[PDB]
């Protein structure tokens, strides 16, 4: 991986450059504008409906880092139902439309 000697990022300075949408292949893509302490492991987590304890974010980009000239694109596969994809304090209401 890249970014194992870094830290988890800020919770605040993530803003949506890009709207989380479905890929047409049951994954959710996005892009953040992190203008803070770079680079760092993005706190990507996505809970489900029925249990807000457990993170169920089956990631496709592992270990996302916002580099000094790079980083942003995150893709994840999710189980069906209501899903709150957190990127720090910034979150996103999502329903996985597949069964």
């Amino acid at each position, epitope marked *: 991986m890249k970014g194992l*000697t*870094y*830290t*988890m*990022c*800020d*919770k*605040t*300075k993530f803003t949506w450059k890009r709207a989380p949408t479905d890929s047409g292949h049951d994954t959710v893509v996005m892009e953040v504008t992190f*203008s*803070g*302490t*770079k*680079p*760092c*492991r993005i*706190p990507v987590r996505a809970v489900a409906h029925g249990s807000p304890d457990v993170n169920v974010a089956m990631l496709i980009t592992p270990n996302p880092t916002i580099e*000094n000239n790079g980083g942003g694109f995150i893709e994840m596969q999710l189980p069906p139902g209501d899903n709150i994809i957190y990127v720090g304090e910034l979150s996103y209401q999502w329903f996985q439309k597949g069964s």
Partner: antibody
Amino acid sequence: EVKLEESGGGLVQPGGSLKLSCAASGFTFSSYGMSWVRQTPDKRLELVAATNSDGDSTYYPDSVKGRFTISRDRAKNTLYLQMSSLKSEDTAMYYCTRVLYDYDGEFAYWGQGTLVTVSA
Amino acid sequence: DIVMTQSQKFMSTSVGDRVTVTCKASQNVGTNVAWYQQKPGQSPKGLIYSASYRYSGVPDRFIGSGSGTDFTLTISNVQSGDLAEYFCQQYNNHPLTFGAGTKLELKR
């Protein structure tokens, strides 16, 4: 009145160990983050351990990477720094910090600061 | 690491004058701007972040600018409580490196 009372200022030989604390007041804990910043006696500042809210993870520069242990407590209002294997150039004014709601890298309010002289 | 070199090491000013402090950067860091104000024995003050914002407790005497490599901390109405040490800082890179310190002085 936001207060950051530093403590744990002693006189330990190099290759030793300290444990700093910081009595915090005037702000809720987990909505913000806490960190340590040192100042050398010849007026050259240096980061010790910057870290985010909620005690997620710990950063260290390569000068002190893998030796110290920064930890925290929410309700008790205490920022810890479990140090070990003291370098002789660790004689510096250790400052308890207070980052903003936005975690801006910089620190809005501060403390009076102590001196941990690492002398041979 | 990204160095933050202050051009103003030991500068002086009067009471009523408006002066400013600049600070270098090894590369384009943009709006990762941070300054301070510490007196000897007392605490620093995280006045301006991102070159245009303030915290509650900072007056209109402290403005700022500079997005890129060179920053700008313009201070109008230099009081007796501005006799202090002004630090520079980038919070782009890890580690968030610092300026050595601009000792603002009184003209005599």
